[PDB]
Amino acid sequence: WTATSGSCKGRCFELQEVGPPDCRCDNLCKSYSSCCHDFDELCLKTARGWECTKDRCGEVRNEENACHCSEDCLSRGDCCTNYQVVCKGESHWVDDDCEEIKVPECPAGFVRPPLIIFSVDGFRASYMKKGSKVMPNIEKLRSCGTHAPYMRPVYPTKTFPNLYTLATGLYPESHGIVGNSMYDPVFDASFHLRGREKFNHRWWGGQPLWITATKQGVRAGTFFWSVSIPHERRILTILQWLSLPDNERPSVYAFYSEQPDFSGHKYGPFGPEMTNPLREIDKTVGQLMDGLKQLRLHRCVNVIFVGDHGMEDVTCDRTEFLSNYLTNVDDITLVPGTLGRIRAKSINNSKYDPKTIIAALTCKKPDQHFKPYMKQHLPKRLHYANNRRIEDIHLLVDRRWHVARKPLDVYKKCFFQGDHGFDNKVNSMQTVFVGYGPTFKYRTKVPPFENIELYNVMCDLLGLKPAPNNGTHGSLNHLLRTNTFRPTMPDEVSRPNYPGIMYLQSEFDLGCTCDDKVENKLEELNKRLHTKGSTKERHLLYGRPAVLYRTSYDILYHTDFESGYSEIFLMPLWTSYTISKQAEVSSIPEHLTNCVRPDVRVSPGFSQNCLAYKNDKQMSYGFLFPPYLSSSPEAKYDAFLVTNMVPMYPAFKRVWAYFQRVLVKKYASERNGVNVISGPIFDYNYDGLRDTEDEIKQYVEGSSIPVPTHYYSIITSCLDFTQPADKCDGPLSVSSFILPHRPDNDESCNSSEDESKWVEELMKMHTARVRDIEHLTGLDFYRKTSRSYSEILTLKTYLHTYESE
Ligand SMILES: *[C@@H]1O[C@H](CO)[C@@H](O[C@@H]2O[C@H](CO)[C@@H](O[C@@H]3O[C@H](CO[C@H]4O[C@H](CO)[C@@H](O)[C@H](O[C@H]5O[C@H](CO)[C@@H](O)[C@H](O)[C@@H]5O[C@H]5O[C@H](CO)[C@@H](O)[C@H](O)[C@@H]5O)[C@@H]4O)[C@@H](O)[C@H](O[C@H]4O[C@H](CO)[C@@H](O)[C@H](O)[C@@H]4O[C@H]4O[C@H](CO)[C@@H](O)[C@H](O)[C@@H]4O)[C@@H]3O)[C@H](O)[C@H]2NC(C)=O)[C@H](O)[C@H]1NC(C)=O
Numbered sequence: 001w002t003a004t005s006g007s008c009k010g011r012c013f014e015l016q017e018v019g020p021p022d023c024r025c026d027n028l029c030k031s032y033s034s035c036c037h038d039f040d041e042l043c044l045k046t047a048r049g050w051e052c053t054k055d056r057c058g059e060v061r062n063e064e065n066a067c068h069c070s071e072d073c074l075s076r077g078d079c080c081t082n083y084q085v086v087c088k089g090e091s092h093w094v095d096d097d098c099e100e101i102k103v104p105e106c107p108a109g110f111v112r113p114p115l116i117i118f119s120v121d122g123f124r125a126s127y128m129k130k131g132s133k134v135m136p137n138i139e140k141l142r143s144c145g146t147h148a149p150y151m152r153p154v155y156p157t158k159t160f161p162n163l164y165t166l167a168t169g170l171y172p173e174s175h176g177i178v179g180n181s182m183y184d185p186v187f188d189a190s191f192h193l194r195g196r197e198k199f200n201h202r203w204w205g206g207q208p209l210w211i212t213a214t215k216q217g218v219r220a221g222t223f224f225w226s227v228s229i230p231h232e233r234r235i236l237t238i239l240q241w242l243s244l245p246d247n248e249r250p251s252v253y254a255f256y257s258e259q260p261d262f263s264g265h266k267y268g269p270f271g272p273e274m275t276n277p278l279r280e281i282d283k284t285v286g287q288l289m290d291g292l293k294q295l296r297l298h299r300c301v302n303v304i305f306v307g308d309h310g311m312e313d314v315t316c317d318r319t320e321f322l323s324n325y326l327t328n329v330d331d332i333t334l335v336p337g338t339l340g341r342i343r344a345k346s347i348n349n350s351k352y353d354p355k356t357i358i359a360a361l362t363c364k365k366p367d368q369h370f371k372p373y374m375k376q377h378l379p380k381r382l383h384y385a386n387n388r389r390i391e392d393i394h395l396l397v398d399r400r401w402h403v404a405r406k407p408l409d410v411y412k413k414c415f416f417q418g419d420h421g422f423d424n425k426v427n428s429m430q431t432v433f434v435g436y437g438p439t440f441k442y443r444t445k446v447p448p449f450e451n452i453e454l455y456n457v458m459c460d461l462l463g464l465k466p467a468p469n470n471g472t473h474g475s476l477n478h479l480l481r482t483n484t485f486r487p488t489m490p491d492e493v494s495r496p497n498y499p500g501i502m503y504l505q506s507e508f509d510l511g512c513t514c515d516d517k518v519e520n521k522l523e524e525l526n527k528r529l530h531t532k533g534s535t536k537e538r539h540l541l542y543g544r545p546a547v548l549y550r551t552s553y554d555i556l557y558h559t560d561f562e563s564g565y566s567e568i569f570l571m572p573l574w575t576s577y578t579i580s581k582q583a584e585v586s587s588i589p590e591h592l593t594n595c596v597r598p599d600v601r602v603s604p605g606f607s608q609n610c611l612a613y614k615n616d617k618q619m620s621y622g623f624l625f626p627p628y629l630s631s632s633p634e635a636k637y638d639a640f641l642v643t644n645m646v647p648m649y650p651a652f653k654r655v656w657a658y659f660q661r662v663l664v665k666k667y668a669s670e671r672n673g674v675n676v677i678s679g680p681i682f683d684y685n686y687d688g689l690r691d692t693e694d695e696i697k698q699y700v701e702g703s704s705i706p707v708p709t710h711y712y713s714i715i716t717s718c719l720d721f722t723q724p725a726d727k728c729d730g731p732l733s734v735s736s737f738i739l740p741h742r743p744d745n746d747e748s749c750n751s752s753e754d755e756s757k758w759v760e761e762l763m764k765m766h767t768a769r770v771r772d773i774e775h776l777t778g779l780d781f782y783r784k785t786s787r788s789y790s791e792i793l794t795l796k797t798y799l800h801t802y803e804s805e
């Protein structure tokens with residue numbers, strides 16, 4: 001109940017919200033059915049429209065008009081946005097040449113440049129080029145400010161997950177808004193676009209920018225406009241707030257447009273009907289900028305033009321139906337569309353079987369337009385598993401398609417020609433970023449980056465300390481003319497030991513054999529130098545990684561590779577080696593096929609053993625530095641050390657051997673040498689973070705050898721490929737991956753074929769940022785380069801996507 005008997009006179013769009021049953025005059029009231037009786041009359045005026053005309057100039061203030069052309073309007077702060085253009089001979093902001101904004105040019109009383117976030121729903125990245133002729137205001141912001149060719153949304157590339165990620169810097173798994181539709185079990189409740197449940201605060205985690213601002217004494221306008229408040233009124237309201245007295249005026253503002261998303265669903269991303277909503281968004285930008293110029297704020301305010309996700313062509317006839325795969329299709333609930341999430345229809349049923357459901361959905365049709373996953377097997381780059389609201393069974397749907405349960409769900413719910421929500425690497429899902437103002441750079445292009453990074457920058461722009469988030473603070477410093485954040489390297493927590501020869505062969509009882517009893521003072525001094533780290537500048541190009549947690553580990557040097565060997569996990573945490581363009585691939589000699597050699601620098605008690613692998617009928621093993629790439633027949637013996645061995649499913653060895661035998665050399669040839677760092681990852685609770693020892697759920701049978709959930713590699717070379725990887729003077733180039741360590745290759749439908757037909761495609765799918773690997777390992781890479789730290793941070797957030805142009 002609301003006693004909606006009070007009034008809004010003089011209170012229109014008040015900034016603080018009064019609590020029921022007092023009636024409300026804030027821009028949120030419409031959504032709660034709690035606006036005072038006179039809200040529309042007083043606060044939502046429309047008379048005479050939104051523009052001044054010649055004959056309105058100098059008029060007698062009529063308070064009934066939507067906006068004013070009277071003489072007192074400037075100081076009343078409520079002129080139509082085009083007032084000075086029509087009634088004072090001034091020019092439109094878009095008509096002026098752009099001039100560099102070297103310093104903030106603000107009215108007296110402004111303690112900091114205001115921030116205005118202009119967010120647009122469904123604004124696909126390629127609209128910037130393809131719609132450029134009809135968006136002159138947006139085009140000026142873009143070319144005169146700082147812009148990226150596109151910005152990467154988060155998965156799922158839905159509206160609510162992405163808007164709330166923009167506001168918090170958090171992955172949907174961490175902020176809790178994991179989709180446009182949700183079921184929570186612990187609450188026991190559902191969340192929908194249509195409805196009032198979405199308004200309960202219990203769904204919304206993290207700390208959004210407006211709360212971060214308020215807690216630190218920076219005032220905020222609202223970030224939530226009611227759907228019925230027209231755009232011209234949102235703009236005029238922001239402009240009025242900007243005329244408030246210094247002690248009442250917000251420092252951060254948001255505008256939101258439901259377009260072009262709304263039209264894109266109906267007409268497809270490039271439907272002829274799309275030109276008009278793009279004209280209209282541009283007009284609104286024009287209005288804001290003319291309005292700022294009027295208030296003399298156009299060289300004072302920082303403006304962010306940002307989208308939530310793009311839009312793809314999707315129609316009803318591109319729908320896969322689960323009723324064509326399953327028989328018990330009535331025993332499940334599907335969250336349908338551009339992604340699938342499956343759970344049991346009823347919690348009282350113990351006859352429900354996820355493994356059988358998955359199996360029934362795997363590679364069943366030659367053309368299948370989706371792939372099922374247990375959520376923990378989804379590519380780690382999606383960061384989409386660590387939330388009770390995310391169902392165990394997930395369907396990644398092909399771009400341009402939908403998944404539905406049964407045909408009845410589609411024709412009794414073609415409506416639509418566009419949709420979004422697909423994997424966030426897909427070109428059609430990419431969106432836009434432009435920054436314009438005194439704090440952003442002038443006429444500057446920046447590389448594509450992820451929307452999780454923006455919260456830190458918005459906080460920097462307002463002098464706020466960001467709440468803990470998934471951005472990497474400093475990775476976007478290159479966007480800004482002046483930075484208040486200078487990042488520093490995390491301190492190394494554990495220092496390594498450097499063991500020498502300490503054990504005799506006969507102390508080892510590991511059940512390993514090698515045919516290596518084959519016998520020179522010249523090359524006896526040589527091998528000693530290699531074990532002391534003579535070749536280390538060759539294979540360790542960027543310094544050793546820093547270990548950022550408490551543990552026990554040894555640095556081990558070899559002719560061809562260096563490693564950091566964990567006495568706790570009984571395997572390297574990391575193995576580093578360089579393969580030059582000219583290097584050669586050899587095979588493993590017949591006599592050294594099953595060879596594993598004790599490492600005399602490392603105690604039997606901290607070594608793996610061959611017997612466990614023999615006893616374990618599921619588990620085999622592989623090597624981190626590949627024997628195939630040894631530099632000499634003598635150096636090859638190094639690759640069979642027990643300290644280079646890691647547990648591998650036979651199914652996984654197919655993937656790993658192909659990467660090591662074929663792909664490393666191909667990358668070296670194409671990139672003019674590569675440096676490779678590889679190692680294990682343990683993430684049994686799928687939270688994206690390194691597991692402690694007591695979290696491991698699987699060991700090689702009858703041993704304390706832990707089984708990795710994933711294997712990573714980081715492959716670095718010179719951005720200037722005319723220079724070899726090992727003699728690079730400038731910026732670096734990186735690609736990385738985190739491969740799931742699986743006992744089958746069910747994920748790859750063509751895995752019965754030669755590795756040359758599927759393995760690389762799998763690896764591409766599991767592309768990763770160096771930063772993802774850092775979280776998963778507790779390691780810190782690139783400690784010793786010539787490059788500035790902000791540049792290294794940008795490099796660590798880079799994702800190689802494998803999409804066309
Ligand atoms: C992306 O960035 C984010 C933010 O930096 C990273 O997430 C953080 O990771 C931290 C480590 O996992 C985590 O810290 C834990 O906090 C626990 C309490 O935290 C509450 O308060 C904070 C701060 O206000 C709040 O943010 C949290 O909000 C969560 O929960 C609410 C309501 O449930 C949700 O609405 C909200 O969305 C959010 O949910 C998300 O996080 C939780 C986990 O916290 C997930 O389960 C959800 O799925 C969802 O993703 C919290 O309300 C605190 O209790 C923990 O402490 C335990 O562990 C330490 C180890 O040092 C130990 O010392 C303690 O004693 C304690 O152990 C005890 O509890 C155990 C579990 O009950 C028990 O087993 C033991 O026996 C002990 O009794 C811990 O410190 C932090 O909360 C989140 N923050 C967020 C916002 O998610 C994220 O890691 C980054 N991602 C990547 C890939 O890097």
Ligand SMILES: CC(=O)N1CCC(C2=NNC(=O)[C@H]2/N=N/c2ccc(Cl)cc2)CC1
Pocket residue numbers: 160163164201210221222223224
């Ligand atoms: C005390 C508390 O927690 N809250 C926060 C939530 C409400 C809001 N505060 N400020 C707003 O603009 C409004 N929600 N805005 C949003 C904008 C985008 C999105 Cl996806 C979701 C919400 C009421 C207060």
Ligand SMILES: CC(=O)N1CCC(C2=NNC(=O)[C@H]2/N=N/c2ccc(Cl)cc2)CC1
Pocket residue numbers: 117119163164166167198223224225226227254255256
């Ligand atoms: C029902 C619900 O809660 N949502 C809120 C989100 C959408 C919005 N409706 N009105 C808004 O202004 C808009 N949020 N805008 C934002 C402005 C800035 C930023 Cl960073 C993020 C969002 C759809 C409805």
Ligand SMILES: [Ca+2]
Pocket residue numbers: 682683684685686687688689690691
């Ligand atoms: Ca973990």
Ligand SMILES: [Cl-]
Pocket residue numbers: 156158178179180181335
């Ligand atoms: Cl959804």
Ligand code: NA
Pocket residue numbers: 613614615616617618619620
């Ligand atoms: Na075995």
Ligand code: NA
Pocket residue numbers: 745746747748749750751752
């Ligand atoms: Na297969």
Ligand SMILES: [Zn+2]
Pocket residue numbers: 122159261262265420
């Ligand atoms: Zn949409």
